[PDB]
């Protein structure tokens, strides 16, 4: 067993830096358990969005509407990363999809970190596979959890 | 200078009957989305600040507790269905609702509540005769025992989160019911426990009782973990000396005894542990904490302990191992001990848990649900419950009718056929009664997202041609033979549900006044 | 066509073109609704059928479904469709350019 | 206190909206299981619900939406 000793000039500094280790410990925990990783920065969502979008046109049926919607929902992640960085989410997403279609499907990230360029291969922004897999599946399951609710009855609180 | 009421309420007249209907329909509307294997879940916030999520009509209505003096009749009759049949509570309210809906315009046209109720009573008798005629007496014909029960659970799990994993969970359900007494199948004997983590297909079937392994205290784990033929002892008392929470003062008559009190308490726990050794137990359970001294003593005596066991589990352990629970340690006899064929520790959920296995005396079993989220595990439990019930009923009651609305449509047909010879006002009521029977295949289609109009029209044509078992298919939006597809339920479900729905219908419609005493 | 051609566009133009193409569906959607047909069903059938057809597939109120526009004699002069595209675009241009109104007397 | 931890923020968000509570339950599962996506799973789930709103308004049954989203998720992971 080990203990992580954190110091700092104030309570909030120690509390946040200490909790920062918690997050990093979770990352390295997952990397040890499952060696499979994917690139982050929203690159995975763009790749998955493109794949679902291309497959949607193959449905030729009612489901086509949901498949396109699902892809558009994925786009909201790299767009959020743009907006929270002060970037144009429309120019950003256009660039993200364009690079992964015109040049190579290889993961293309966003400039959220203020680095000279995107292309996370040289930037080392990496998420565990099991993390991104669960993120997509669990968010979808939750959406279904709410969509299937057709009646809510709320009583008081004792 | 005198009045009649002083805050005493009474309301009488036909308007009260219609008002009673409207309140009763409101209950139907709360429950109508719960019908069918694709029924929607309802969120109820109780006064205890806990939230309940379920599409089980019995759960929902029992928690709803409609206050209106007339609508409470729907609550009572649903509870009767829950006690007498055990299923169909959603369909009893729905059928009762639609019958009362049709009673309303009949009352407006000047048809007395007696004439409406009289026609309903006749219509039920006509329907019940058809339901019996439609019933099939079938067990393992052109099949075997597990073959039917496998198909039954597999059907229940269709189009669920565990659809692709049915090959794993269907076995659990079939084994769970067949592990019970074959003369009296009681769903209460099948326990379900939620363990987070892992994939759903990794769920485990256990013949005995699992524990939650509540230990975190330093010094634990250093006790044997496996036994071949253990004796099992259950206590209602704790076995700990110094807890991480509690404490005590030391008060003595002599200074030399100051230290003695600390060791005296050690002896008091030791002596209790020693009497357990004299009993000859191999595993010792308690609903209360078991501490370090108990673990170190028991380990050196080759005894395993597990405390803080849920009260529900302690009772089930006794039901598994065939022993008897005791509060004291001085009065324990070997006849109080149970026996298992195995004690082991499992890795279910990627975390260690204790369990008994292969208990020769068991009347119960335990199902362990795995999954990546509590919400998904909850969905698995609901799917298992329905799968267990249909397996239980298919094994218990061989007298069946086709489900999926197939019976309601065949009953609807014969009711309309009878109206061809029923003259007078009775013709109006027998028609309305037949109409009510159609709401079931309707709301089954609507709740499933189907074109209910198209499916209902095809069902009417099919039965008119003599296709008496066709109903709503939920895997493909069409109609098909629910008997051949093994979409079964006992005949008594339709007989008792229809009798019960009418009884509530007529009782509510019979009331022309409500009296309320206030103050 | 515009949904696919938009894939060659970049930036705001790519997103706006997709919105333009979607807006066009208001017509076959409205026709399906007024004809008593399921909106999504009719529009979906047309979109899939135009994988092989070009102008032969459309809504016929006579046949109450998606059928052969030529055999049913459902024809409109080019000028009518062309004018609808132009004038509708000019109107939207004119409306979006209005940021204020002042009185003059 | 000041933080950008989505898990802490959602935990400190105290609400009686039962639908919002379901989103909090999602973030709890991700926080215990993986510990990374506690913000993303709620933002994405909302994005899917936003798409569901338009799909419902266009005449797509909520069940057809739920089934389509499930199959789309399978495609998304298959590519991932």
Curated annotation (Swiss-Prot), chain B:
GO terms for cellular component: chaperonin-containing T-complex; cytoplasm. GO terms for molecular function: ATP binding; ATP hydrolysis activity; ATP-dependent protein folding chaperone; unfolded protein binding. Keywords: ATP-binding, Chaperone, Cytoplasm, Nucleotide-binding. One of its GO terms (biological process) is protein folding. The keyword Nucleotide-binding applies. Its main location: cytoplasm. PROSITE patterns: TCP1_2 (PS00751), TCP1_3 (PS00995). It is found in: Cytoplasm. Heterooligomeric complex of about 850 to 900 kDa that forms two stacked rings, 12 to 16 nm in diameter. Molecular chaperone; assists the folding of proteins upon ATP hydrolysis. Known to play a role, in vitro, in the folding of actin and tubulin. In yeast may play a role in mitotic spindle formation. Belongs to the TCP-1 chaperonin family. This is T-complex protein 1 subunit eta. It comes from Saccharomyces cerevisiae (strain ATCC 204508 / S288c).
UniProtKB/Swiss-Prot annotation, chain C:
Transmembrane segments: none annotated. It is found in: Cytoplasm. It comes from the Eukaryota. Heterooligomeric complex of about 850 to 900 kDa that forms two stacked rings, 12 to 16 nm in diameter. Present with 5530 molecules/cell in log phase SD medium. Molecular chaperone; assists the folding of proteins upon ATP hydrolysis. Known to play a role, in vitro, in the folding of actin and tubulin. In yeast may play a role in mitotic spindle formation. Belongs to the TCP-1 chaperonin family. This is T-complex protein 1 subunit delta. It comes from Saccharomyces cerevisiae (strain ATCC 204508 / S288c) (Baker's yeast).
From Swiss-Prot, chain D:
It comes from the Eukaryota. It is found in: Cytoplasm. Molecular chaperone; assists the folding of proteins upon ATP hydrolysis. Known to play a role, in vitro, in the folding of actin and tubulin. In yeast may play a role in mitotic spindle formation. Heterooligomeric complex of about 850 to 900 kDa that forms two stacked rings, 12 to 16 nm in diameter. Belongs to the TCP-1 chaperonin family. This is T-complex protein 1 subunit epsilon. The chain holds residues 82 to 161 of 562 of the full protein.
